[PDB]
Short mmCIF file of C-alpha atoms and ligand atoms in Angstrom, two decimals:
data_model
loop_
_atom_site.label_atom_id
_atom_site.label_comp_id
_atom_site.label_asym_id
_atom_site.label_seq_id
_atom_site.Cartn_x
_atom_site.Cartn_y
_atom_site.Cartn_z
CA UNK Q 1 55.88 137.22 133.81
CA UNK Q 2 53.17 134.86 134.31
CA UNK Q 3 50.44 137.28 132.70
CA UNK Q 4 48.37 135.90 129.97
CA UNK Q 5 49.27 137.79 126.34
CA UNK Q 6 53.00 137.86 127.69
CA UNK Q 7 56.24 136.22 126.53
CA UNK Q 8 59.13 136.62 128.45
CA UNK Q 9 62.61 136.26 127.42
CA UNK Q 10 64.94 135.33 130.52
CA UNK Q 11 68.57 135.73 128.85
CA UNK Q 12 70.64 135.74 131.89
CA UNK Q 13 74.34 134.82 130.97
CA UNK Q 14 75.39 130.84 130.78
CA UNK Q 15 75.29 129.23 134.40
CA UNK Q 16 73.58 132.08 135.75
CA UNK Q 17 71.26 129.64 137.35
CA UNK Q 18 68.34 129.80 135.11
CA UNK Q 19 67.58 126.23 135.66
CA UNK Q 20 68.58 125.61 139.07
CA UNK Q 21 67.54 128.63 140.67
CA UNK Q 22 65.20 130.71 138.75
CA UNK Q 23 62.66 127.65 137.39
CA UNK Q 24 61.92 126.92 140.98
CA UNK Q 25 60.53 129.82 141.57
CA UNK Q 26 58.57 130.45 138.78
CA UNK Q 27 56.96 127.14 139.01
CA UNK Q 28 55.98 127.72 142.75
CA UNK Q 29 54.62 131.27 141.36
CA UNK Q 30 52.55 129.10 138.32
CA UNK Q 31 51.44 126.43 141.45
CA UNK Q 32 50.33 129.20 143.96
CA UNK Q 33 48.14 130.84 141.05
CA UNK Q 34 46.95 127.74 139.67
CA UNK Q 35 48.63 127.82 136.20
CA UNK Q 36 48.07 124.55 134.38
CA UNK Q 37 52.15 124.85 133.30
CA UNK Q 38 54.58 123.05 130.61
CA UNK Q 39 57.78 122.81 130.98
CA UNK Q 40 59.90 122.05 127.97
CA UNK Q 41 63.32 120.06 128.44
CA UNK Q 42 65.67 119.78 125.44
CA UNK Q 43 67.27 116.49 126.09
CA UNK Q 44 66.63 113.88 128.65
CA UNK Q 45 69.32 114.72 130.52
CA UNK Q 46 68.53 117.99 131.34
CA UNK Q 47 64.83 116.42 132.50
CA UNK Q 48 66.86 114.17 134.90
CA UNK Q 49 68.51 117.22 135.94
CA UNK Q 50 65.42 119.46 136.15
CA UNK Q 51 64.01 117.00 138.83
CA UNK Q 52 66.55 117.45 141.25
CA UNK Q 53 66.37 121.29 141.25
CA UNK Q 54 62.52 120.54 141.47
CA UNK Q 55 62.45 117.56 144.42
CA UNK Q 56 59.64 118.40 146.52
CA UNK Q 57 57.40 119.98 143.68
CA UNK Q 58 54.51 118.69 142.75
CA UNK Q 59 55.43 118.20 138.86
CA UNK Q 60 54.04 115.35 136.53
CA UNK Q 61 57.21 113.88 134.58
CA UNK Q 62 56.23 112.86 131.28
CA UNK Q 63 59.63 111.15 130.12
CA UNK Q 64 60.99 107.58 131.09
CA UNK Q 65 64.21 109.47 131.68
CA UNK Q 66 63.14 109.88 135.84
CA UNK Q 67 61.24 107.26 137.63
CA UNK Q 68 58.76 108.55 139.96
CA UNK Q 69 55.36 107.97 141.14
CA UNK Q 70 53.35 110.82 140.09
CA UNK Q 71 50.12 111.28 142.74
CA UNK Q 72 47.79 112.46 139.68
CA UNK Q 73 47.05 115.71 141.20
CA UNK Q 74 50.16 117.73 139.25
CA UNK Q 75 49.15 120.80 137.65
CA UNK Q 76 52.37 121.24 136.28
CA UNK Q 77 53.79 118.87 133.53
CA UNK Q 78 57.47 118.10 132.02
CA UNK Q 79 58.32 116.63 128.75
CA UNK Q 80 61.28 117.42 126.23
CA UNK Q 81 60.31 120.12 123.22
CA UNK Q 82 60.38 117.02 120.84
CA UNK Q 83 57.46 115.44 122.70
CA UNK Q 84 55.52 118.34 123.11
CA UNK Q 85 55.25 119.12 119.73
CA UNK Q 86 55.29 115.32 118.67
CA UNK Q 87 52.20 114.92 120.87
CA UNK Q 88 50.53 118.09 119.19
CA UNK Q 89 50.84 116.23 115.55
CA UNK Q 90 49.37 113.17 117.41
CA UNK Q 91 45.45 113.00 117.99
CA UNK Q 92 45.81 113.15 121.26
CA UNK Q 93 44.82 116.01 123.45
CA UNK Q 94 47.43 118.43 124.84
CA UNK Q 95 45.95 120.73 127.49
CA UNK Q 96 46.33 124.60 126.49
CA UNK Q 97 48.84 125.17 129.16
CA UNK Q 98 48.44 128.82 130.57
CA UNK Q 99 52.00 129.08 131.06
CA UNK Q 100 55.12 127.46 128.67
CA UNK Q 101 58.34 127.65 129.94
CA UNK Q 102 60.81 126.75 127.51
CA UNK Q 103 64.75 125.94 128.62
CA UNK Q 104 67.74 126.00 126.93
CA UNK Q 105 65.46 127.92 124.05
CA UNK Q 106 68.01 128.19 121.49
CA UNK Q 107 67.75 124.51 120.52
CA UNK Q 108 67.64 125.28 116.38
CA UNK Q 109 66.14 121.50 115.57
CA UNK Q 110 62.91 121.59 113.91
CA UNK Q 111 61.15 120.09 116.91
CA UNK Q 112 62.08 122.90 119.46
CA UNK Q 113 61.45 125.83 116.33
CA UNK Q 114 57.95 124.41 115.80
CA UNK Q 115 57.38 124.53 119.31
CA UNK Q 116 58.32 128.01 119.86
CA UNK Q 117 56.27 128.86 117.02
CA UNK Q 118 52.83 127.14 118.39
CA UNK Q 119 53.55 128.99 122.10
CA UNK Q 120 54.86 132.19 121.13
CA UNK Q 121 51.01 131.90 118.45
CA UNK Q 122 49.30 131.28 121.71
CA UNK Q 123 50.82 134.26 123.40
CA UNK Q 124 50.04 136.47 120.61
CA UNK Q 125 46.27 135.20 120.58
CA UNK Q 126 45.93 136.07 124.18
CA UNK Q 127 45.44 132.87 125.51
CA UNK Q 128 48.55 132.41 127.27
CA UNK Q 129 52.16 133.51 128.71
CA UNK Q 130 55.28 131.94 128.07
CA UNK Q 131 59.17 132.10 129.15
CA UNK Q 132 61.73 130.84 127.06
CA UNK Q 133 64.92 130.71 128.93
CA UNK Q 134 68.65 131.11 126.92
CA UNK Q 135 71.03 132.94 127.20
CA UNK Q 136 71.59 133.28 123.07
CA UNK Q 137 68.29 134.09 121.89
CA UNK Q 138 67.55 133.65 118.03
CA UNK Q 139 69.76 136.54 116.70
CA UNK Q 140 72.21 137.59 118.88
CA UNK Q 141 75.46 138.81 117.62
CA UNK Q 142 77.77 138.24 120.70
CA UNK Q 143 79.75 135.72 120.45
CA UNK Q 144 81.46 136.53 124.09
CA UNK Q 145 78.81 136.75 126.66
CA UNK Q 146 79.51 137.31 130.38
CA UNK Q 147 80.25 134.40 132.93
CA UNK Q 148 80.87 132.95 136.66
CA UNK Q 149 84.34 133.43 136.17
CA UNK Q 150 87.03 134.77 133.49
CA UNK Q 151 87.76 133.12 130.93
CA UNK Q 152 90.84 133.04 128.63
CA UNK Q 153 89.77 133.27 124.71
CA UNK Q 154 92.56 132.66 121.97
CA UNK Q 155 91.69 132.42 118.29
CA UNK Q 156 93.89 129.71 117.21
CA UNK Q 157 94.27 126.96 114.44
CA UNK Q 158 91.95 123.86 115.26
CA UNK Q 159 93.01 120.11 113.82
CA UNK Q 160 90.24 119.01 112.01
CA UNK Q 161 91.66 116.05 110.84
CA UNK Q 162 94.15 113.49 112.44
CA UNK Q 163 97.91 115.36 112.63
CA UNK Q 164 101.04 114.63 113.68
CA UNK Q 165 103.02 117.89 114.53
CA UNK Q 166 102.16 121.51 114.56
CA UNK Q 167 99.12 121.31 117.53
CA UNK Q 168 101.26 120.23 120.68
CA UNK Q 169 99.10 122.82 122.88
CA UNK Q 170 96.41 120.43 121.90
CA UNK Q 171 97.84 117.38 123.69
CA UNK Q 172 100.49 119.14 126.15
CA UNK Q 173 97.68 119.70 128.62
CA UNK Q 174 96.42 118.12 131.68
CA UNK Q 175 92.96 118.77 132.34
CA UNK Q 176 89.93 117.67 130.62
CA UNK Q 177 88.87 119.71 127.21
CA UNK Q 178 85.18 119.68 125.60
CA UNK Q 179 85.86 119.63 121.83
CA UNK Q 180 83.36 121.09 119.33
CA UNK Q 181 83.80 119.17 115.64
CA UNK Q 182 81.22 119.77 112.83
CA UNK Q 183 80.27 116.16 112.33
CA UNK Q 184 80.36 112.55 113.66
CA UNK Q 185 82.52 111.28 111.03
CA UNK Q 186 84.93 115.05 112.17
CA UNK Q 187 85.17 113.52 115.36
CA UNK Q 188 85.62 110.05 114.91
CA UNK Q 189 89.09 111.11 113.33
CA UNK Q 190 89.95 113.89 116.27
CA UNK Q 191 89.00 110.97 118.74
CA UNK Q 192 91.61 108.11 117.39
CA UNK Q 193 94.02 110.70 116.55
CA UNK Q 194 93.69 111.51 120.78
CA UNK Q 195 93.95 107.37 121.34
CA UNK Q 196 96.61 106.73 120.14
CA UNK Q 197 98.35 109.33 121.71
CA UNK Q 198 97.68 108.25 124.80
CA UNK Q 199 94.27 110.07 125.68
CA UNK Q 200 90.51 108.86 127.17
CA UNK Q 201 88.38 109.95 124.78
CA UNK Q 202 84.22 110.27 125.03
CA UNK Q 203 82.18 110.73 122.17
CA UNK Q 204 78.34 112.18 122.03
CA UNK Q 205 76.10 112.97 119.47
CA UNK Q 206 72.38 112.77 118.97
CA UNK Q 207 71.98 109.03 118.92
CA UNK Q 208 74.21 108.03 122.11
CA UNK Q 209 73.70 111.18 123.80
CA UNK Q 210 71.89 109.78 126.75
CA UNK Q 211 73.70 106.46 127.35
CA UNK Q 212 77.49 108.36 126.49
CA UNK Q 213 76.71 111.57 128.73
CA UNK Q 214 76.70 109.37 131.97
CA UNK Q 215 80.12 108.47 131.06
CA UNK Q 216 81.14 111.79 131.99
CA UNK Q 217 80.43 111.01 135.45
CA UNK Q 218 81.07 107.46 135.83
CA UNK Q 219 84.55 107.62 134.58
CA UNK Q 220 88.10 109.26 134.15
CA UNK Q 221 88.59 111.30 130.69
CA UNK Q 222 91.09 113.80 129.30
CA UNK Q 223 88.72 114.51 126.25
CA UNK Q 224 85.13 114.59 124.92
CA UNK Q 225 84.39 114.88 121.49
CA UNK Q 226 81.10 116.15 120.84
CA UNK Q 227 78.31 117.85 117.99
CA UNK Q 228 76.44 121.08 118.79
CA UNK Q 229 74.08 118.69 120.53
CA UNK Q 230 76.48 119.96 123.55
CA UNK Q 231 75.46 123.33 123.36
CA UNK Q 232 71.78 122.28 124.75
CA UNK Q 233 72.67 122.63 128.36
CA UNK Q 234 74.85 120.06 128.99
CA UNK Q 235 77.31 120.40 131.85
CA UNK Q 236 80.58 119.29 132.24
CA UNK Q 237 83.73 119.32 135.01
CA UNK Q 238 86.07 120.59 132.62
CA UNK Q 239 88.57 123.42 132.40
CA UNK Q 240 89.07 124.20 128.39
CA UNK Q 241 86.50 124.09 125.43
CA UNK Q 242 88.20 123.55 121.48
CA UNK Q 243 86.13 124.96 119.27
CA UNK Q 244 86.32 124.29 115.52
CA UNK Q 245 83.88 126.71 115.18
CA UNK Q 246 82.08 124.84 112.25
CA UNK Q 247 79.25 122.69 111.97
CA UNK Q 248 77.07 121.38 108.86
CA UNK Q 249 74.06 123.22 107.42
CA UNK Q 250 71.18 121.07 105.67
CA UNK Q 251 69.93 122.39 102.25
CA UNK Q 252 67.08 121.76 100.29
CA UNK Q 253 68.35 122.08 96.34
CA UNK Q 254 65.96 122.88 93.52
CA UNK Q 255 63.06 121.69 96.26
CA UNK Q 256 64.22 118.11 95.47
CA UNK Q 257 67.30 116.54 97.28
CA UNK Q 258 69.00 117.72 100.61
CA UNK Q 259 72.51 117.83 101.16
CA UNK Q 260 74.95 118.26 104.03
CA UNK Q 261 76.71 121.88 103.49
CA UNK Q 262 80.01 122.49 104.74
CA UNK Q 263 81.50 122.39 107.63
CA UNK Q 264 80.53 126.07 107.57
CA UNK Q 265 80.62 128.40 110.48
CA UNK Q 266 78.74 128.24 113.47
CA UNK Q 267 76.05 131.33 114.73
CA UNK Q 268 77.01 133.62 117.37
CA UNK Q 269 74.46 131.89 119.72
CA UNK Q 270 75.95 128.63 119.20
CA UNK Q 271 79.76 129.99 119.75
CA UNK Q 272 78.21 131.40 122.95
CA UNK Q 273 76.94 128.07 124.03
CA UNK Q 274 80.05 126.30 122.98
CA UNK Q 275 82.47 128.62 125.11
CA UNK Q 276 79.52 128.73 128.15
CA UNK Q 277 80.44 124.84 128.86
CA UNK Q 278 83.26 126.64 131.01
CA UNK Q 279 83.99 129.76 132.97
CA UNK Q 280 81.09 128.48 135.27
CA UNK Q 281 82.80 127.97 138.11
CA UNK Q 282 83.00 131.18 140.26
CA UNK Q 283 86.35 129.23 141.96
CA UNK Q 284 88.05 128.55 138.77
CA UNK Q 285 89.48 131.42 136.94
CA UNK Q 286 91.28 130.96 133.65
CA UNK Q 287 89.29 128.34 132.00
CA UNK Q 288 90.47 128.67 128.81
CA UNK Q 289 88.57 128.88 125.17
CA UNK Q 290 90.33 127.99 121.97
CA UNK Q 291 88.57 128.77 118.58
CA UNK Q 292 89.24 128.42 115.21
CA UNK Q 293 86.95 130.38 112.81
CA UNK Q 294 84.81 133.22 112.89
CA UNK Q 295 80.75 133.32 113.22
CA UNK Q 296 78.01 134.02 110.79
CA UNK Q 297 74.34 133.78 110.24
CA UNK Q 298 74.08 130.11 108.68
CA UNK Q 299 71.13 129.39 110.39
CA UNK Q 300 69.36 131.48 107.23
CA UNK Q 301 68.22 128.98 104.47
CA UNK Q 302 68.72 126.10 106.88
CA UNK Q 303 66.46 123.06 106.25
CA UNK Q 304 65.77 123.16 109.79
CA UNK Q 305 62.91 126.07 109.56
CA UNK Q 306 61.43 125.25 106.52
CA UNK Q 307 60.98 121.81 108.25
CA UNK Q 308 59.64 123.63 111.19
CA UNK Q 309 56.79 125.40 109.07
CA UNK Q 310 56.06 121.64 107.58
CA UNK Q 311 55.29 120.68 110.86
CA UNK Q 312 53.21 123.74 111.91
CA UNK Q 313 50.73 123.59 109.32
CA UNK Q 314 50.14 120.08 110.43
CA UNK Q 315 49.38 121.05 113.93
CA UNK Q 316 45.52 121.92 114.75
CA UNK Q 317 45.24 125.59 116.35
CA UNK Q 318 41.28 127.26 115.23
CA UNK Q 319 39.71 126.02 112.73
CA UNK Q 320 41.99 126.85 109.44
CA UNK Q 321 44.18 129.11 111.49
CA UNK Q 322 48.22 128.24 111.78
CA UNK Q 323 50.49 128.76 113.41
CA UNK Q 324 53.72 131.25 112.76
CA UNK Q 325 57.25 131.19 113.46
CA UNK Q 326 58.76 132.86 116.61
CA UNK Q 327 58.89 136.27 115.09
CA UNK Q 328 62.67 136.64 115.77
CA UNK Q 329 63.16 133.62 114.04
CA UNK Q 330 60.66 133.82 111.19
CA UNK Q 331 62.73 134.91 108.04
CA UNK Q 332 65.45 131.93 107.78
CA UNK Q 333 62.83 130.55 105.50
CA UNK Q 334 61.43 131.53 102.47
CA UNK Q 335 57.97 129.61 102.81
CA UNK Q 336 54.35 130.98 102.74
CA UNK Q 337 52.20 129.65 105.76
CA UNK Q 338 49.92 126.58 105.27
CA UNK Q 339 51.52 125.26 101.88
CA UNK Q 340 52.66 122.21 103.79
CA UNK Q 341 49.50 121.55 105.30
CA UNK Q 342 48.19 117.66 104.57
CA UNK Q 343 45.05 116.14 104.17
CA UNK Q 344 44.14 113.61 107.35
CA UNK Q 345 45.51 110.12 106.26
CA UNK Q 346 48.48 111.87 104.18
CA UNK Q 347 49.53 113.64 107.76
CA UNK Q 348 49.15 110.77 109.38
CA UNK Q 349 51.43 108.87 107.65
CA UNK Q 350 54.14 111.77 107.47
CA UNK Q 351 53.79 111.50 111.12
CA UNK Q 352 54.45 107.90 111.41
CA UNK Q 353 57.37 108.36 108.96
CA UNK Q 354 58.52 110.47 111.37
CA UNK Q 355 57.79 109.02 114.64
CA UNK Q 356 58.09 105.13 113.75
CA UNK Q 357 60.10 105.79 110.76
CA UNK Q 358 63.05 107.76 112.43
CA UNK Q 359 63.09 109.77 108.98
CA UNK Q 360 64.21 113.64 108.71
CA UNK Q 361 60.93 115.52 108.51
CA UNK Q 362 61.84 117.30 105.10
CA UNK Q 363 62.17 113.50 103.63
CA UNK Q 364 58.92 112.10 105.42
CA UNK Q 365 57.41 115.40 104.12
CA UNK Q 366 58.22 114.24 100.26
CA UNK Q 367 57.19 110.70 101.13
CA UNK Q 368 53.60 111.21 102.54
CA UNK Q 369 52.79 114.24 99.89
CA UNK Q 370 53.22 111.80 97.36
CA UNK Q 371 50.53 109.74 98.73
CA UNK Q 372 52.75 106.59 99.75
CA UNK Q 373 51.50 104.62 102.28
CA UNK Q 374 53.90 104.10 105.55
CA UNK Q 375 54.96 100.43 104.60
CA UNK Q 376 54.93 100.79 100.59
CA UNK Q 377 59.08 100.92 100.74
CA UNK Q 378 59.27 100.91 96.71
CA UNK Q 379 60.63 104.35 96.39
CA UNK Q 380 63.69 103.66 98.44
CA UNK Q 381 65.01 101.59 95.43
CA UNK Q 382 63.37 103.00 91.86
CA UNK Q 383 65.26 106.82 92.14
CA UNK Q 384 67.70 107.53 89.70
CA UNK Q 385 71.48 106.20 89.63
CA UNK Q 386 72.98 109.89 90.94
CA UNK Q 387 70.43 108.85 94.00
CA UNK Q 388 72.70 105.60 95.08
CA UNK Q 389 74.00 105.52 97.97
CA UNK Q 390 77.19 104.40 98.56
CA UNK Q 391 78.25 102.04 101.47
CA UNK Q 392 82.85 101.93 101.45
CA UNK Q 393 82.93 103.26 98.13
CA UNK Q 394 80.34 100.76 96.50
CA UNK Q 395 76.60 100.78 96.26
CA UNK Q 396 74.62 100.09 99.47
CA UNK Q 397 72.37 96.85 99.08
CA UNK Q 398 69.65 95.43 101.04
CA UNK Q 399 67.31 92.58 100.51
CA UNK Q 400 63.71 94.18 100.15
CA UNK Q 401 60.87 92.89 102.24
CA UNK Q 402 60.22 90.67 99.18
CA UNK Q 403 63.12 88.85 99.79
CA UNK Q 404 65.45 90.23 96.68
CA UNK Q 405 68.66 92.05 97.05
CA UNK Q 406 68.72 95.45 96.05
CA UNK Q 407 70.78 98.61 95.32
CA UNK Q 408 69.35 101.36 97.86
CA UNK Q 409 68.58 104.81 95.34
CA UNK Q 410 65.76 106.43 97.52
CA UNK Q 411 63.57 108.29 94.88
CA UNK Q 412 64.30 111.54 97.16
CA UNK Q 413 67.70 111.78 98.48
CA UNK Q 414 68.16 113.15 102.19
CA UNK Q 415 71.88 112.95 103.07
CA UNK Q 416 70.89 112.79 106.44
CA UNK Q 417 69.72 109.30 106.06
CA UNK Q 418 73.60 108.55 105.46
CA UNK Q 419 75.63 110.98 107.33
CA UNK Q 420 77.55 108.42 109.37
CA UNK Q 421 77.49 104.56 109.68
CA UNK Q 422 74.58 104.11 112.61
CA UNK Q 423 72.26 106.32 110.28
CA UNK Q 424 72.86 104.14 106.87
CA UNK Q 425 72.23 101.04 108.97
CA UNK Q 426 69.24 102.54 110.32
CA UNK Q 427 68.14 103.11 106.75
CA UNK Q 428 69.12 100.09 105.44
CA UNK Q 429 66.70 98.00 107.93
CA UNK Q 430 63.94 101.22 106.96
CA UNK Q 431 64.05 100.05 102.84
CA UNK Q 432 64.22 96.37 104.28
CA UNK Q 433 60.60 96.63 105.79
CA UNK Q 434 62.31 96.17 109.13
CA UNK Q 435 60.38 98.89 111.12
C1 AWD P 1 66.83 110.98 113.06
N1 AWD P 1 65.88 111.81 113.80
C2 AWD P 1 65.78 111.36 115.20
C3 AWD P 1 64.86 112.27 116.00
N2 AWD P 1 63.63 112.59 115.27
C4 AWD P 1 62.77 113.52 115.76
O1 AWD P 1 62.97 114.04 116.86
N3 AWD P 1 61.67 113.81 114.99
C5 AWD P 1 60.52 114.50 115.43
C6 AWD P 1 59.85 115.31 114.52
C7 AWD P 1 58.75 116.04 114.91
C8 AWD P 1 58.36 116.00 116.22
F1 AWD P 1 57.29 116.74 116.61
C9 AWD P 1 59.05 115.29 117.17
C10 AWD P 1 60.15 114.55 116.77
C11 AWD P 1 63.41 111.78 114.07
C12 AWD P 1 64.59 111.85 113.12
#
């Protein structure tokens, strides 16, 4: 495994113990044979998790997610993928680990593809191994993988929306459920619908992942309503997973707007992940799995790998060499290698979009190409009308940095930068100068 020129996949089936058991080892393999060694987190909380399965390991945590006091003589380093690949877009240096090990690999955002992409480059070069641990990796077509203990599976009719009769299963039980729903906005209906009928309801997504997820384990709940962002090794004490089976797909149109597709179904991998929240518990039989749609592969033409590429031809490998896409992965995107790649003070604003900016990468991409400095904030209000965004049914207005209100009509439209309430604020202060 730990053999330079050599990527290993370890696809052992959900709760297996690839992070509790297996990483342990492998990093007390990489320590005896003095392996300079990455390991890549997808979330903070599987970080905070990773350091209690590693407690006595000398491992250099480079996340404010654990608090320790790290004796500077770690060989070994941990950071989430978004870091790691945020860090090589930075100027600073990032050693050329001789191992990456990669958990909960499937993560499909363009952070975690670009990463892949850079190791699995590395590997190919010779210069390196790799493992990237999942138990979905990028293509698999079963939806049903093995686990710790049965599980039942009905295909069933899912409420997307708020209902009244028709779903009493839904409610009728008395143990706590993990619900799947395409979008924030999905679940924000599913949620108050569950309220006021009586249920605790937790909600996660990307922005309150963190902070929400310890509400899991602080408190009493009957339900938690959650994105895909779930599927990214997050574990819960519950005994059924809903699955809507849908999520939304980001497309670029005629190379000039994004939209939100969908709801749309989900891959096999991420139906995998979704049902592997339960059936890990070995003591626990009949956890049960309720879906409502069938799989396909919508991760082809997602605006997730074509963002991916933008970022790898902005990351230095030899001289004008870049890096490709995780073979497996590679053909979701119709894109020819280095056609994203910026000129020095053009990437590093696309960076800062990115980083300070909080933008989607496909809409700091547009930004930065067209030679717009990171604080010129005119082209969030001179697009044309069909670019408005709409705030209740009305036009969204801000008052510009200059001091005048405004109607916000970005000159490139991302719907991303709308997609719920929290990310139009967060745009709003954005066009205001705010950040
Ligand atoms: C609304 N999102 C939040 C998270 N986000 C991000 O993770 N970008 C990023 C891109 C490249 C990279 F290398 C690391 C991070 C910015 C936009």
């Amino acid at each position: 495994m730990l053999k330079k020129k050599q990527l290993t996949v370890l696809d052992l089936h959900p709760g297996a113990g690839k992070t509790r058991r297996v990483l342990p080892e492998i990093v007390r393999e990489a320590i005896k044979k003095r392996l300079r060694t990455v390991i890549l987190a997808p979330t903070r909380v599987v970080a905070a998790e990773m350091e209690e399965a590693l407690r006595g390991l000398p491992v250099r945590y480079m996340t404010t997610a654990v608090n320790v006091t790290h004796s500077g003589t770690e060989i070994v380093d941990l950071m989430c993928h978004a870091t790691f690949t945020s860090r090589l877009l930075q100027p600073i240096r990032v050693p050329n680990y001789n191992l990456n090990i990669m958990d909960e690999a499937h993560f499909t955002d363009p952070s975690s593809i670009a990463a892949r992409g850079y190791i699995s480059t590395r590997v190919e070069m010779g210069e390196a191994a790799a493992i990237f641990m999942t138990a979905t990796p990028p293509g698999t077509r079963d939806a049903f993988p093995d686990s710790n203990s049965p599980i039942m599976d009905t295909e069933v009719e899912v409420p997307e929306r708020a209902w009244s009769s028709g779903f009493d299963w839904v409610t009728d039980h008395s143990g706590k459920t993990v619900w799947f729903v395409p979008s924030v906005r999905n679940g924000n209906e599913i949620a108050a619908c569950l309220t006021k009928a009586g249920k605790r309801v937790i909600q996660l997504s990307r922005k309150t992942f963190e902070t929400e997820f310890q509400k899991t384990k602080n408190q009493e709940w009957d339900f938690v309503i959650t994105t895909d962002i779930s599927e990214m090794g997050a574990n819960f004490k519950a005994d059924r997973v809903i699955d809507s089976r849908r999520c939304l797909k980001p497309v670029i149109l005629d190379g000039e707007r994004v939209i939100l597709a969908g709801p749309m179904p989900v891959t096999h991998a991420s139906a995998a992940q979704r049902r592997g929240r339960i059936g890990r518990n070995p003591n626990k039989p009949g956890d049960e799995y309720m879906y409502g749609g069938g799989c396909a592969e919508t991760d082809e033409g997602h605006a997730h790998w074509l963002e991916a590429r933008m970022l790898l031809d902005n990351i230095y490998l030899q001289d004008g060499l870049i890096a490709s896409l995780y073979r497996p992965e590679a053909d979701k995107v119709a894109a020819i290698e280095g056609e994203f790649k910026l000129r020095t003070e053009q990437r590093k604003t696309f960076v800062e979009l990115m980083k300070r900016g909080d933008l989607p990468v496909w809409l700091a991409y547009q930004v930065a190409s067209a030679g717009i400095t990171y604080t010129d904030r005119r082209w969030c209000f001179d697009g044309t009308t069909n670019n408005t965004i709409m705030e209740d049914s009305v036009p969204a207005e801000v008052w510009t940095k200059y001091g005048e209100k405004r109607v916000l009509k970005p000159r490139w439209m991302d719907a991303r930068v709308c997609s719920d309430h929290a990310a139009l604020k967060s745009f709003k202060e954005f066009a205001a100068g705010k950040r």
